[PDB]
Nucleic acid binder design. Structure first.
Ligand SMILES: Nc1ncnc2c1ncn2[C@H]1C[C@H](O)[C@@H](COP(=O)(O)OP(=O)(O)OP(=O)(O)O)O1
Ligand SMILES: [Mg+2]
Ligand SMILES: [Mg+2]
Ligand SMILES: [Mg+2]
Length: 378
DNA sequence: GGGGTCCT
DNA sequence: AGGACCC
């Protein structure tokens, strides 16, 4: 059962949202700042030299006409994120989320229908929407191709409906699994879509340069492979299965090797509603017992907001700390579920804290987070 | 340095 | 509770 998956990726998301909010900013170049960095910006300002993830001063010097904006309150982005996800669900119910600006959709069933509904005669021109990866020749006689071309049209449709109705632009990659879909989706940016035919699969993995470029292989797994002298995607393709299992575990080994061939059988998971809420906060110095108290209050303060609105309730709370991450958690008592409600929580959160960190001694940390998970019904 | 997700 | 991964 060959699948058709689509990966959707919004162009410079925060930027887009900001612009869609303050139209005056269409004309102007724009950057979104978190702490003293620039986390993303519209294209009008990537041309003036502004690289994503660059300090806000180099930014200003390199580009003086730059209109900055604060993107530390993730609230407008997160609402837009779900407006997008809901739009896409209205196409097919099975939509997986990846951060705020990515979505996976399984179009296998949807492509099925549209095909059957095709009178033989009209089996052309059929056509393709957007780019075909690596300019590959289409073979209308190959069902696999045909189902991917239909996947391209549904994607073009989704992208139209995102623009109309939400005012957002973005790219789409349509492939036979999530891996290839995500990889081929950025081959043409911004605001364009590419489809990957099967016979160009190998061209696409090898186009990659560092092995960490593949989704799934990350910082910790890369370094492991590096120290094994695995740097190219072909290195990994050709390496000893056995030695890899031995050095990575039989679970991780099998999967990432398949990855390096472009093989990915992981299904698209239906995300549904968020299963957690959390406010992170890292900082220069924190070294008493209070000031964690102040922090935990603020964090709690902001989180509470979102919980009041979500609907369902958290039956578990936890405390996270990256020291000099660790966590402790415990169920949230029956009474307190009455969305005042602060002091009891912070008493628990502190109880948590205390058992984890010795207050009768110095610590200093850099990171405090509070998380609400385990929400019913579930 | 956000927020999140699944696997162990 | 910790360790991976994605953004
Ligand atoms: N290093 C980072 N630090 C903080 N926020 C980030 C970082 N990277 C990305 N983000 C945020 C900002 C973006 O709106 C969103 C997705 O980023 P990313 O996938 O890198 O592409 P992008 O949305 O910045 O634009 P584009 O895909 O056009 O380059 O996540
Ligand atoms: Mg992205
Ligand atoms: Mg993006
Ligand atoms: Mg990676």
């Amino acid at each position: 059962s060959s699948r058709v998956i689509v990966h959707v990726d919004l162009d410079c998301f925060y930027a887009q949202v900001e612009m869609i909010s303050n139209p005056e900013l269409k004309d102007k170049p724009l950057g979104v700042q978190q702490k003293y960095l620039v986390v993303t910006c519209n294209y009008e300002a990537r041309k003036l030299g502004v690289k994503k993830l660059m300090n806000v001063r180099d930014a200003k010097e390199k580009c003086p006409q730059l209109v900055l904006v604060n993107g530390e309150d993730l609230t407008r982005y997160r609402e837009m994120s779900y407006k997008v996800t809901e739009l896409l669900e209205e196409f097919s119910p099975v939509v997986e989320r990846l951060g705020f600006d990515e979505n996976f959709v399984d179009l296998t069933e949807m492509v099925e229908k549209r095909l059957q509904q095709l009178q033989s005669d009209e089996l052309s021109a059929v056509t393709v929407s957007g780019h075909v990866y690596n300019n590959q020749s289409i073979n209308l006689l190959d069902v696999l191709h045909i189902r991917l071309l239909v996947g391209s049209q549904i994607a073009a449709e989704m992208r139209e409906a995102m623009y109309n109705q939400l005012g957002l632009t973005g790219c789409a990659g349509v492939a036979s699994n999530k891996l290839l879909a995500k990889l081929v989706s950025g081959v043409f940016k911004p605001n364009q879509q590419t489809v990957l035919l099967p016979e160009s699969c190998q061209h696409l993995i090898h186009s990659l340069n560092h092995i960490k470029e593949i989704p799934g292989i990350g910082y910790k797994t890369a370094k492991c492979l590096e120290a094994l002298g695995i740097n190219s995607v072909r290195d990994l393709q050709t390496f000893s299965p056995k030695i890899l299992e031995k050095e990575l575990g039989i679970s991780v080994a099998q999967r990432i090797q398949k990855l390096s061939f472009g093989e990915d059988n992981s299904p698209v998971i239906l995300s549904g509603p968020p299963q957690s809420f959390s406010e992170e906060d890292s900082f220069k110095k924190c070294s008493s017992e209070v000031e964690a108290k102040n922090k935990i209050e603020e964090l709690l303060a902001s989180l509470l907001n979102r919980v009041c609105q979500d609907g369902r309730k958290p039956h578990t709370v936890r405390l996270i700390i990256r020291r000099y991450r660790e966590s402790r958690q415990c169920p949230i008592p029956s009474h307190v579920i009455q969305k005042d409600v602060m002091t009891p929580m912070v008493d628990i959160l502190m109880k948590l804290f205390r058992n984890m960190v010795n207050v009768k001694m110095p610590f200093h940390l850099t990171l405090l987070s509070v998380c609400f998970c385990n929400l019913k019904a579930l």
